[PDB]
Design an enzyme around this catalytic site. Structure first.
Site, mmCIF file in Angstrom:
data_model
loop_
_atom_site.group_PDB
_atom_site.id
_atom_site.type_symbol
_atom_site.label_atom_id
_atom_site.label_comp_id
_atom_site.label_asym_id
_atom_site.label_seq_id
_atom_site.Cartn_x
_atom_site.Cartn_y
_atom_site.Cartn_z
ATOM 1 C CG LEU A 134 6.922 -2.196 -11.493
ATOM 2 C CD1 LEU A 134 6.442 -0.816 -11.088
ATOM 3 C CD2 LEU A 134 8.420 -2.331 -11.270
ATOM 4 C CG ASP A 141 6.223 3.176 6.069
ATOM 5 O OD1 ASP A 141 6.943 2.599 6.907
ATOM 6 O OD2 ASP A 141 5.080 2.738 5.773
ATOM 7 C CB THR A 171 0.209 2.218 4.282
ATOM 8 O OG1 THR A 171 0.460 3.020 3.119
ATOM 9 C CG2 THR A 171 1.258 1.110 4.366
HETATM 10 C C1 X14 Z 1 3.199 -1.110 -2.101
HETATM 11 C C2 X14 Z 1 1.699 -0.816 -2.251
HETATM 12 C C3 X14 Z 1 1.429 0.345 -3.210
HETATM 13 C C4 X14 Z 1 2.039 1.620 -2.647
HETATM 14 C C5 X14 Z 1 -0.088 0.547 -3.302
HETATM 15 C C6 X14 Z 1 2.072 0.031 -4.607
HETATM 16 C C7 X14 Z 1 1.968 1.280 -5.557
HETATM 17 C C8 X14 Z 1 2.614 1.021 -6.951
HETATM 18 C C9 X14 Z 1 2.330 -0.371 -7.419
HETATM 19 N N1 X14 Z 1 2.549 -0.843 -8.669
HETATM 20 N N2 X14 Z 1 2.190 -2.140 -8.814
HETATM 21 C C10 X14 Z 1 1.717 -2.503 -7.596
HETATM 22 C C11 X14 Z 1 1.227 -3.757 -7.346
HETATM 23 O O1 X14 Z 1 0.601 -4.019 -6.325
HETATM 24 N N3 X14 Z 1 1.433 -4.738 -8.311
HETATM 25 C C12 X14 Z 1 0.930 -6.119 -8.210
HETATM 26 C C13 X14 Z 1 1.737 -7.020 -7.314
HETATM 27 C C14 X14 Z 1 2.876 -6.554 -6.594
HETATM 28 C C15 X14 Z 1 3.582 -7.439 -5.761
HETATM 29 C C16 X14 Z 1 3.148 -8.779 -5.653
HETATM 30 S S1 X14 Z 1 4.026 -9.873 -4.616
HETATM 31 N N4 X14 Z 1 3.629 -9.538 -3.009
HETATM 32 O O2 X14 Z 1 5.424 -9.678 -4.843
HETATM 33 O O3 X14 Z 1 3.628 -11.246 -4.937
HETATM 34 C C17 X14 Z 1 2.024 -9.246 -6.360
HETATM 35 C C18 X14 Z 1 1.319 -8.360 -7.193
HETATM 36 C C19 X14 Z 1 1.796 -1.416 -6.674
HETATM 37 C C20 X14 Z 1 1.419 -1.265 -5.220
#
Ligand code: X14
Length: 294
Positions: free
Chosen positions: A79, A123, A14
């Protein structure tokens, strides 16, 4: 960032691009968000920086904030999956009620914690709720546009989801309260239960009207002051409130009771995270192990 070795670009958050990266000295894997322009948000930057002390099991840790040469990097605990993906993966069968309950309970603990420290998320949405193999779920990306800002686009042509936006925000209230987070979590709870978004609006007014069509057009009786809100229009259509048993079938009355309290129009009547934790719906809460495919 040379102390980091980009593993892969995860996506476009975002505010900026998100990368999976490895710290070449600790060997730890993290999520790195790169944000962006002249002005240097001094206050915005300081706001974010204080979040480093906001440590709780259900809040994704903000490891570091680095401001350097026209860019702001936020380093987060990594994560592997988010709730939006898990919900999609579980769409055919549905997330088991005990897991829905555990996730809701954990998210309420996280909100109770941040709200007690005067921090709002603003959000909340499935995509910023991260899960792991141990059955944990954690809140990520606290917007705090209170001194940073929240645009209608992430940063480069990307439609802002309004599905979880509290009505007071849509009606132009200038002061958000902790209640906006409870509303968003209520919408997410309903979505986990029915496997369909509760209010999937595609514009601010469509979002507002979808809420009115389901919960009834608000009035001074259920929401004192609603008719004096910035964007309130006497010309809004007047819809009757739908029977609540029609909205999240086949959720039991304990769950429906809690949801109704999280979705009250009046932010002052909406249940707090701390009070929600004590709701009878959580009398039999447990912590199941989800089956995640990574
Ligand atoms: C929410 C965005 C923010 C605020 C930057 C998040 C901040 C903290 C954070 N920690 N890990 C991740 C992360 O991105 N992991 C890899 C991953 C997560 C989900 C999926 S998924 N669509 O479930 O296949 C695939 C890989 C984030 C992004």
């Amino acid at each position: 960032m040379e102390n980091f070795q980009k593993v892969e670009k995860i996506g476009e958050g975002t505010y900026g691009v998100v990368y999976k990266a490895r710290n070449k000295l600790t060997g730890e894997v993290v999520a790195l968000k790169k944000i962006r322009t002249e002005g240097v948000p001094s206050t915005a930057i300081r706001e974010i920086s204080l979040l480093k002390e906001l440590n709780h099991p259900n809040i994704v840790k903000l490891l570091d904030v680095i401001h350097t040469e026209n860019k702001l990097y936020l380093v987060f605990e990594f994560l592997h999956q988010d709730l939006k993906k898990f919900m999609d993966a579980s769409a055919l069968t549905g997330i088991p009620l005990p897991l829905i309950k555990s996730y809701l309970f954990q998210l309420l603990q996280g909100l109770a914690f941040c709200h007690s420290h005067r921090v709002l998320h603003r959000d909340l949405k499935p995509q910023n709720l991260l899960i792991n193999t141990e059955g944990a779920i954690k809140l990520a990306d606290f917007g705090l546009a209170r001194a940073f800002g929240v645009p209608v686009r992430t940063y480069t042509h990307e439609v802002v989801t309004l599905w979880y936006r509290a009505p007071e925000i849509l009606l132009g209230c200038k002061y958000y309260s902790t209640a906006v987070d409870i509303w968003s979590l209520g919408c997410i709870f309903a979505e986990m239960v029915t496997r369909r978004a509760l209010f999937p609006g595609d514009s601010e007014i469509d979002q507002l009207f979808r809420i009115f069509r389901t919960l009834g057009t608000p009035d001074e009786v259920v929401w004192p002051g609603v008719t004096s809100m910035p964007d309130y229009k006497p010309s809004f259509p007047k819809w009757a409130r739908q029977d609540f048993s029609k909205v999240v079938p086949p959720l039991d009355e304990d769950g429906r009771s809690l949801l109704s309290q999280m979705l009250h129009y009046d932010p002052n009547k909406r249940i707090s995270a701390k009070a929600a934790l004590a709701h009878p719906f959580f009398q039999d809460v447990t912590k199941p192990v989800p089956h995640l495919r990574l």
